[PDB]
Every structure is written in structure tokens, then in C-alpha cells.
Amino acid sequence: AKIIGGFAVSHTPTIAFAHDANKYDDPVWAPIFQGFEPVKQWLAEQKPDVTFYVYNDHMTSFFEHYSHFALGVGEEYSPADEGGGQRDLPPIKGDPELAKHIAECLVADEFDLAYWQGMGLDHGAFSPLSVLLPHEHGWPCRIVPLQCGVLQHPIPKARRFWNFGRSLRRAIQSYPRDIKVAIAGTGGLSHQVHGERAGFNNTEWDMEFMERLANDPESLLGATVTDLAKKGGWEGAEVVMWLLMRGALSPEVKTLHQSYFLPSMTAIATMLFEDQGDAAPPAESDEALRARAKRELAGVEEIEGTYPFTIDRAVKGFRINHFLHRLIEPDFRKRFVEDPEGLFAESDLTEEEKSLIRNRDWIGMIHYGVIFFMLEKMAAVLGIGNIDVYAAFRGLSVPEFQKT
Amino acid sequence: AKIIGGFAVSHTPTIAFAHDAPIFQGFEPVKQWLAEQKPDVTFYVYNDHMTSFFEHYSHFALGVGEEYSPADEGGGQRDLPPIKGDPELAKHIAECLVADEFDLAYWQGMGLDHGAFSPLSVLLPHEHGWPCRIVPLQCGVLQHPIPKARRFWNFGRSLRRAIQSYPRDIKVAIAGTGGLSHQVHGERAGFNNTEWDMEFMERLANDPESLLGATVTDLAKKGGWEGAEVVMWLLMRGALSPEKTLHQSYFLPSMTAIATMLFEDQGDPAESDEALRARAKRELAGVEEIEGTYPFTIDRAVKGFRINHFLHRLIEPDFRKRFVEDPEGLFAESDLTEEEKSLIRNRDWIGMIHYGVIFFMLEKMAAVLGIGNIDVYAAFRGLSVPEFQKTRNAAITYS
Ligand SMILES: [Fe+2]
Ligand SMILES: [Fe+2]
Numbered sequence: 008a009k010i011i012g013g014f015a016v017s018h019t020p021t022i023a024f025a026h027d028a029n030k031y032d033d034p035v036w037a038p039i040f041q042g043f044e045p046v047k048q049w050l051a052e053q054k055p056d057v058t059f060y061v062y063n064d065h066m067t068s069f070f071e072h073y074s075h076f077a078l079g080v081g082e083e084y085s086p087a088d089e090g091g092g093q094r095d096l097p098p099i100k101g102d103p104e105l106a107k108h109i110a111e112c113l114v115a116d117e118f119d120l121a122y123w124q125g126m127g128l129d130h131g132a133f134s135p136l137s138v139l140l141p142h143e144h145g146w147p148c149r150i151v152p153l154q155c156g157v158l159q160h161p162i163p164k165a166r167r168f169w170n171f172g173r174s175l176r177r178a179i180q181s182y183p184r185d186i187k188v189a190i191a192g193t194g195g196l197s198h199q200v201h202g203e204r205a206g207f208n209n210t211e212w213d214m215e216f217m218e219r220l221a222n223d224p225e226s227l228l229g230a231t232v233t234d235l236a237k238k239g240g241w242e243g244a245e246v247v248m249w250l251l252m253r254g255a256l257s258p259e260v261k262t263l264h265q266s267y268f269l270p271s272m273t274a275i276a277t278m279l280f281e282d283q284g285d286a287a288p289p290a291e292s293d294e295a296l297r298a299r300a301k302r303e304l305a306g307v308e309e310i311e312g313t314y315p316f317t318i319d320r321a322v323k324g325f326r327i328n329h330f331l332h333r334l335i336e337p338d339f340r341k342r343f344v345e346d347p348e349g350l351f352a353e354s355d356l357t358e359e360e361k362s363l364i365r366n367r368d369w370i371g372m373i374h375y376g377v378i379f380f381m382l383e384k385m386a387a388v389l390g391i392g393n394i395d396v397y398a399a400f401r402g403l404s405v406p407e408f409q410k411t
Numbered sequence: 412a413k414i415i416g417g418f419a420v421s422h423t424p425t426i427a428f429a430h431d432a433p434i435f436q437g438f439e440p441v442k443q444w445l446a447e448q449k450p451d452v453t454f455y456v457y458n459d460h461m462t463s464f465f466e467h468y469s470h471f472a473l474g475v476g477e478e479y480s481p482a483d484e485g486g487g488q489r490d491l492p493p494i495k496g497d498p499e500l501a502k503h504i505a506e507c508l509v510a511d512e513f514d515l516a517y518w519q520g521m522g523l524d525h526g527a528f529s530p531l532s533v534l535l536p537h538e539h540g541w542p543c544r545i546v547p548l549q550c551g552v553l554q555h556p557i558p559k560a561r562r563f564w565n566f567g568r569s570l571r572r573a574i575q576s577y578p579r580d581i582k583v584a585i586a587g588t589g590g591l592s593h594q595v596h597g598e599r600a601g602f603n604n605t606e607w608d609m610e611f612m613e614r615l616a617n618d619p620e621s622l623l624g625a626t627v628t629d630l631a632k633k634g635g636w637e638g639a640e641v642v643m644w645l646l647m648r649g650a651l652s653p654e655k656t657l658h659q660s661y662f663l664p665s666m667t668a669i670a671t672m673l674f675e676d677q678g679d680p681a682e683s684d685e686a687l688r689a690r691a692k693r694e695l696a697g698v699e700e701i702e703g704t705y706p707f708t709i710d711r712a713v714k715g716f717r718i719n720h721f722l723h724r725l726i727e728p729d730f731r732k733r734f735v736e737d738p739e740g741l742f743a744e745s746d747l748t749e750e751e752k753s754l755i756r757n758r759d760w761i762g763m764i765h766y767g768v769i770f771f772m773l774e775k776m777a778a779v780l781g782i783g784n785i786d787v788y789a790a791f792r793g794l795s796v797p798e799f800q801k802t803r804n805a806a807i808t809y810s
Contacts, residue, residue: 024809035805066771070723074469074516090725090775091810114556119514121469122554158769159517160695160708161509170512200784201770203761204703205791206802233698241704242770271803272788303556307628312598313636317555332465334485370598378553379596380461384485397666400600408601411663 008182008293011053012260012281013190013252014046015220016135018062019198019273020089023134027094039275042266043138046279049263050139051147056186057102059109059179059255061153061248062131062193065089069154074121075163076171078113079152080106080318081325087127096133099146105182106151107318111300112178118171122318124325128152135193148189157194157245165235166228168247172254179255181293181300192252196267196274199240206272212238213267213274216246221262221278224253249278257283314373324376327360331381340388367391369399414574415448417585417651418534419615419644419672422457424525425665426533427489434669437660438533441673444657445535445542451581452497452544454504454574454650455527456643457588459549462524468554469516471566474547475501475709476716482522491528494541500577501546502709506691507573513566517709519716523547530588543584552589552640560630561623563642567649572680574650576687587647591668594635601666602635608661608668611641616656616672619648644672652677707769715767718751722772731779760790778810785809 022039030036050058067087069077083098110120132152140147156162163171179188196213199205216239219226227250235244253260264279291299307315314320321328334340342350351361363372367389372382386396398408418441429435462482464472478493505515527547535542551557558566574583591611594602611634614622622645630639651674660671682690689696698706705711712719724730733741742752754763758780760773770787777787785808789799800806 021807021809035807065774066719066723066769067726069467071520071720072464072467072469072472072516072518074467074472075514077467077469077516088726088728090731090778092728111556114558117559117562119470119558119562121467121516121551123467125466156516158707158771159712160706161506163509163514164512164694167512167514199704200788201764201791202703202705203791203793204701205788206799231696232694233696233701236698236704236706237701241701241706270805271800271807272784303559303627305626305628307631310599310628310632310636312600313594313631314597315555315631315636316553321554328461329466332461335462335483337483337487340485373596378461380553383460383595387485397595397600400597402598411601 008180008184009187010176010179010255010282011055011187011189012279013192013256014280015192015249015252015276015278016043016046016139017195017273017275017277018131018134018193019275020130020134021271021273022138022275023094023130026137035270039268039270040138042268042277045264046277047139049279050189053187053189055148055189057105057149057151058189058191059151059153059175060132060191060193061155061251063155063157063245063248064129064131066158067129068126069156073156073159075156076118077121077123077154077156078106078110079124079154080110080122080322081124082322084128084150084152086133087129089129093127094133094137096137096142097145099136100149102149102151103318103322104184105179108182108300109151109175109178110318112181112296113171113174115300115302116174118174122321123154124322125329131193155248155251157247160232162232165230165247165250168251169224169228169254172251175251176255177289177291177296181296183297190252190255192249194245194248195239195243196246196276197239197243198273200242200272202241204241207240208269208274209238209240210267210269210274213276217265217276217278220249220253221260221280224250253280256280258286259283314376316378320376324378326356327363327375327377328381330354330356331377331385334384334388343388369396370402373400412577412579412581414571414583414585414650414676415450416674416676417454417587417647418444418674419647419670420530420586420588421590421667421669422526422530422588423667423669424529425667426669427525427529430532434662434664435533437662437669437671440658441671442534444673445584448582448584450543450584452500452546453584453586454546454548454570455586455588456548456550456647457526458552458640458643459524460526461553463521464549464551468551470551470558471513472516472518472549472551473501473505474519474545474549475505475517475713476519477713479523479527479545479547481528482524484524489528491532491537492540494531495544497544497546498709498713503577503691504546504570504573505709507576507687508566508569510691510693511569513569517712518549519713520720526588550643550646552642555627557627560625560642560645563646564623564649567646570650572682572687576684576691578688585647585650587644589640589643590634590638591641591670592634592638593667595637595666597636599635603663603668604633605661605663605668607633608670612659612670612672615644615648616674619645652679705764711767715769717746717748718755718763718766718768719772721745721747722755722768722776725775725779734779760787764791781810783808783810
């Protein structure tokens with residue numbers, strides 16, 4: 008509920024590869040890294056419980072199904088394989104509770120989202136995180152990733168991004184827990200990595216963009232994709248994510264840091280903004296907001312025999328829902344039948360979850376957080392009729408239950 | 412151009428099960444009305460039920476691809492010919508909604524589950540081919556929180572004016588499917604309210620706006636938990652004229668109330684299509700004047716879908732093993748055009764960019780073949796690597 012500030016950093020895979028190759032000493036990379044140093048230190052001094060981390064995925068975990076604002080509600084996240092094998096980094100913790108509250112506040116504000124769990128984080132996240140946070144063992148904070156689909160046009164308008172960040176700030180502030188949150192916008196600055204125009208940069212624009220983002224960001228809310236792409240290269244237009252981050256911070260900020268290095272394709276830039284706190288008192292109170300978000304499911308617990316599928320539920324049943332969901336894969340459900348045990352022993356499912364499947368325990372699976380449709384798959388596969396599943400739910404014999 | 416109205420219906424999978432009865436008879440007036448008006452495209456609002464949409468689960472997933480085959484739900488591919496999509500239409504829809512500040516997702520290639528195909532089979536003749544084209548909208552009503560009722564309404568409202576801005580003479584049927592009232596899970600599995608059912612099917616048509624305050628708690632208490640999915644009817648409803656029912660239905664053979672509604676478009680605005688087509692085009696207008704740049708818009712996503720999808724697989728360890736050691740076998744098993752295989756065989760970087768491969772797939776390929784991004788960029792610029800590095804402030808390599 009305390010926003011301490013935000014930072015902005017390029018996320019080019021070259022940062023990661025300079026890190027993994029220990030080019031910290033390298034004549035070329037040494038000074039780049041030194042540019043990371045004040046952000047690294049601030050983060051180490053300020054000790055945020057959570058970083059709300061805005062990035063875009065590069066056709067790795069998001070491709071055949073591609074969304075604008077995909078909020079990560081998961082328990083942990085590991086490096087995505089981008090074709091060369093997973094980088095060697097421990098997994099980093101998510102924050103389902105913060106993510107839930109944020110989703111609720113953002114939906115209330117008529118932002119349409121996507122939720123996701125379990126998928127790799129690509130260079131968009133881990134490239135700069137690996138240089139800004141000690142990871143030799145685990146990570147110093149949790150993360151709530153927000154993947155933004157800036158690659159497949161049409162994409163949301165720059166002003167839409169800013170507005171998301173304006174709602175995001177109130178979402179986090181109203182989070183009724185006493186923690187520190189930092190916000191990260193990532194990507195940029197100028198570059199283009201495709202076409203005969205590959206190699207384009209524009210330091211003049213990068214320098215102008217950073218200054219305006221710091222001191223007059225509402226001035227940018229009119230730029231089209233064409234304006235951004237002309238000035239900052241095609242892929243440089245991803246800087247709408249910095250806009251998002253900046254929107255979440257106070258109207259006015261202190262810029263503690265700025266650095267810029269253009270060694271090859273990408274202008275590798277970082278900024279660190281210290282929140283100044285709400286200039287005014289806020290329009291809607293942390294109380295009216297929390298209730299506004301709580302609204303759509305107000306009273307729902309009065310409904311009995313009923314286990315609503317909320318993020319918390321989805322997160323709690325993920326391991327076993329993911330498992331049961333694979334029953335659409337032919338060799339999988341075939342293994343599910345002929346050799347259920349070696350498959351169980353193949354899984355990350357707990358003994359409890361395995362027990363629930365073996366026991367074909369239907370109402371306890373719903374209890375535990377399995378969504379019905381995954382039972383619908385299991386039942387379909389085992390030759391059980393749906394009716395039997397509703398019989399076992401109701402605690403009745405099929406004929407007993409068939410009273411209608 | 413214009414819309415012919417739109418039908419409402421249950422996507423219950425029993426409607427599918429059954430086909431291998433004043434119920435199939437409930438589908439008649441629809442079934443004929445589909446041949447009558449003869450729709451160019453059907454805009455189909457449904458929800459996937461944790462089959463194709465699970466680990467990444469979005470609110471409004473617009474199908475942009477060219478065709479759709481039935482999803483394996485654990486029981487196997489349901490023998491059915493693919494149905495065609497409308498990428499051009501879908502693009503425009505995307506453009507117009509985004510300008511309206513609706514946040515979307517785009518998807519191609521994934522199967523369609525019973526929530527789509529069950530009804531379509533008893534709705535339109537599949538024997539040989541489908542009688543129209545589809546633009547699916549898959550709404551995440553299963554994982555909470557979900558968009559507000561009013562929200563679903565307004566998306567419908569924009570959908571209308573979007574579809575009315577499409578530069579064509581074509582007629583569109585706007586489907587919207589689900590429910591009606593039921594709960595498929597829990598001790599309270601089996602719940603029903605037909606009194607609520609009728610109050611709903613009736614309030615939708617005559618007094619749609621009056622539903623726009625209902626919450627998830629209300630929809631669940633009255634219609635059962637899964638019954639709340641009926642907000643997908645509101646969305647459908649929003650896409651039509653402010654104000655005739657050509658048919659209705661009902662019966663309760665099992666858990667799910669099976670309802671139908673056949674609406675005829677009676678016509679209506681505040682922004683001229685000269686202003687609306689231009690406003691949609693605004694974000695990317697002028698962009699053709701930026702040389703050496705191939706924006707990745709949906710038309711491009713669709714044209715390059717097969718080969719993007721293929722190179723995408725390079726993230727799987729085994730696939731990229733095959734790619735290196737035995738590429739020809741891989742091509743043979745693929746759905747690639749020989750043109751596409753050629754681009755890949757030729758390691759023709761600029762060509763793939765021109766053809767619609769997105770760079771990040773090329774990045775995967777390059778790395779897999781043990782070659783750097785730099786070799787790729789250099790190739791883009793028709794330069795040798797050292798000559799490309801002359802343009803960099805500092806030369807470096809990496810994959
Ligand atoms: Fe990026
Ligand atoms: Fe459904």
C-alpha cells in the first residue's frame with residue numbers, strides 16, 4: 008500500500024548476456040552496469056516487498072493467444088526457454104493476493120485484463136531483473152508481472168496505457184496490507200530490430216522522451232504509434248510501458264537517476280523516480296475504492312454449496328487443474344488410464360492431490376479448488392457419465408439424484 | 412456493412428452428445444432464418460470451458476485466424492469440417508474497439524470447444540463446409556473477477572458501430588451463446604430458476620438496459636454460478652438495434668435450461684463512418700512512409716501465422732533438436748508452404764521479414780543455428796557483419 012517509486016530500464020537481451028558472461032569488467036560493458044548501480048542500490052536500500060513489473064514478452068510465452076494487459080497471478084515464475092535453454096536463475100515469487108486486489112480494482116475501472124500462471128518469463132523480465140537484483144540464491148522481493156502486448160497491432164493507445172497506470176496506483180495504494188511496492192516500466196528506448204531500417208536510433212528523441220516522462224508525461228499522451236515509431240524505431244514504440252509505469256507514480260516525481268548507453272542496437276536507458284506522494288488528497292477514498300472493487304461479489308458467500316472461481320481459487324488449484332487439463336493430450340489421457348501411477352510420479356502434484364484423483368473424489372476436488380470442467384474431462388476420459396459426478400457432488404446415488 | 416440481427420442460445424455440450432423432441436425443434440426458426448437472410452459472417456460470442464483457454468485466460472479473445480477445427484476435450488476431435496474466419500473483418504473489429512478503449516486479446520490456431528461447435532452443428536449444415544464465416548469472441552466468464560455486465564454491454568455497443576463501419580456490402584449475424592440458468596458444480600449443483608429464465612429472456616429483448624446493473628452475485632444466486640455466463644447474451648444484445656423476437660424456446664431435460672431467441676435487426680449515429688474509419692486508422696496512419704519497416708498488424712499476423720507458429724516451436728528442446736539434425740523430416744510433417752520451407756531453408760532473413768515472420772521468431776531460429784542477432788541485422792541491411800558493425804558505437808556479438 009506504499010508506492011515508494013518506480014524505475015525504468017531497457018530490457019534488451021544483451022543486458023542478460025553481458026551479465027551471464029561476466030562482462031562487468033569489460034571495457035564496453037563496465038560503464039553500462041555502472042549505470043545500473045544507483046537503481047540496484049536504491050532497491051537494496053528501500054527493500055520493496057513487491058515490484059509491480061511491466062514488460063512485454065517477445066513471442067515466447069505469448070504468441071497464439073496474445074493479450075493487451077496480461078496480469079500474472081501465479082505463485083512463482085521461472086526463466087522461459089527462448090531457444091537456447093533456460094537461463095540459470097532461481098524462480099521468483101509472485102503475489103497472488105496483491106494481483107487479485109489489483110485485478111479487482113482494475114476491472115472495477117473498466118480495464119479488461121487477462122490472467123496467467125506457470126509460463127516462463129523471457130528476456131523482457133529477467134534480462135534487467137538479473138542485473139538490478141541479487142539472485143545468486145533467491146530474489147529479494149516478490150513480483151507481480153504485467154505483460155503488455157505491444158507487438159501485435161492494434162495495441163492499446165498511449166493514453167490507455169497511462170490510464171491503466173493511473174488506476175494501478177490507486178489499486179496498490181488501497182491494497183489493505185502494509186507493504187512497500189516499487190513499479191517498473193521496461194523496454195526501449197529507441198531501436199528497430201527488423202527490416203532494412205534495422206539499426207535505427209535517435210538519442211535526441213530518447214533524451215527528450217525521458218525528460219518529458221519525468222516532468223511532463225501528460226504531454227506524451229497524444230503520440231500515435233506512428234509518431235513513436237518514426238522517432239524511436241518500430242520496436243522503440245514499446246516505450247508506452249514506461250508511460251504506464253509513470254502513470255502509477257505521483258503527478259510530480261523526483262528523478263534520482265538517469266543513464267543512457269547506445270553500444271549497438273538498443274539505447275540502454277534507466278531512470279529512477281522517487282514518489283512524492285499524492286499532491287492532493289485522492290478523488291475516491293481507499294475505502295470507497297476497496298468497496299467499489301469488492302462489489303460484484305458482495306454477498307456471494309451467502310450462496311451455499313458453491314465455490315466461486317476467483318484468482319485465489321485458481322491459484323490454489325493450478326497444479327492439479329493444469330494436470331487434469333492435459334487430459335486433452337492423447338498420450339496423456341492414455342497414460343492416465345493404462346498407467347496412472349507413473350504419471351502421478353511424473354507430476355509436481357502433492358500426495359493429497361494424487362490421493363484426490365486416485366480416490367476419484369469428486370466433491371473434495373471441487374472443495375480443494377479443481378474447476379468442474381477439468382473433472383468433466385477426467386470423467387469423460389474414465390467413461391464416467393456426468394450425471395454420476397453430479398450425484399457424487401450432491402452426496403446422492405445417481406438414481407437418488409435423478410429425482411427431478 | 413449491416414447486420415441481419417442475431418440469435419441467442421445455450422452452448423450446452425448435451426446439444427452435441429445428443430446427435431450421435433421439441434428441442435431440436437426449438438432450433439428450427441433460427442435454422443431457417445440462417446438460410447433466409449443468408450449471413451456473410453457470424454460474429455459468435457461464446458466461452459471456452461478451460462480447454463483452449465486455461466493457463467492464459469483473457470476477457471475478450473478475438474479470433475483473427477482463417478479457420479477453426481473442433482477442440483479435443485479429452486474425448487477426441489469431434490468429426491467436423493473446419494469453419495472459416497474473417498481476418499479482414501476481425502482486424503477492423505479490433506481496430507475500432509481498441510480506439511474505443513477496450514482491451515483485447517488476439518488468437519489463431521487453437522481448437523474450438525463444445526461452447527462453439529455443439530450449437531453450430533444443429534444450427535448450420537456442416538455436411539460439406541459451413542454456410543458462412545465466423546468471427547469468434549471468447550469471453551472469460553469462468554475466472555473472477557470478470558468484466559462488468561455494463562462492460563459486456565458497451566463492448567457490444569462498440570461492436571455494432573464497428574461492424575457498421577466495415578467498408579462493404581455484407582450482412583452479419585451476431586450470435587451470443589450460453590446458459591441459460593444452471594450450476595454444474597458443488598452441493599448446489601442442479602440449481603434452476605425458470606421464473607428467472609423467463610424474466611431474463613424477456614428483459615433482454617424489450618428492456619435490455621435494465622439488466623445493466625446486475626452483479627455476479629445476482630446472476631449466480633438466480634441463475635446458478637455458471638448461469639451468470641448469460642452476460643454473453645447482453646453483449647450479443649448490445650450489438651443490435653436499440654429495439655423483434657422471431658422465436659423462443661425452453662426445456663429442462665437435465666441441468667441446463669435450454670433457451671433460444673431469434674432477433675431481427677430493426678436498425679438504429681453520433682460519429683460518421685468517415686470519422687470512425689479514420690479514427691480507427693489514426694494510430695497507424697502515415698506509417699507506410701517509414702521505410703524498411705513492416706508493422707505487425709493482424710493481417711500480417713495471419714499471413715505469417717503458420718511459419719511464426721513453426722519457428723515458435725524452437726523453444727521446445729526436442730523440436731529444435733530435430734530442426735538442426737533433421738530439418739527435412741520436420742518440413743514434411745508441417746503444414747508449411749514450400750515457399751515457407753524455402754525461406755527457412757534459405758535462411759533468408761530479410762525475406763521472412765517481408766513475408767510476415769516477426770523478428771523475435773527469427774531471433775529464436777538464429778540462436779538455434781548458433782548464429783547471432785548481429786548476423787541477422789547485418790543481413791537485413793544487405794551488409795557484411797563488420798560493415799554493419801561500423802554503424803554501431805561498439806561492436807559486440809550475442810544470441
Ligand atoms: Fe520488448
Ligand atoms: Fe459456457
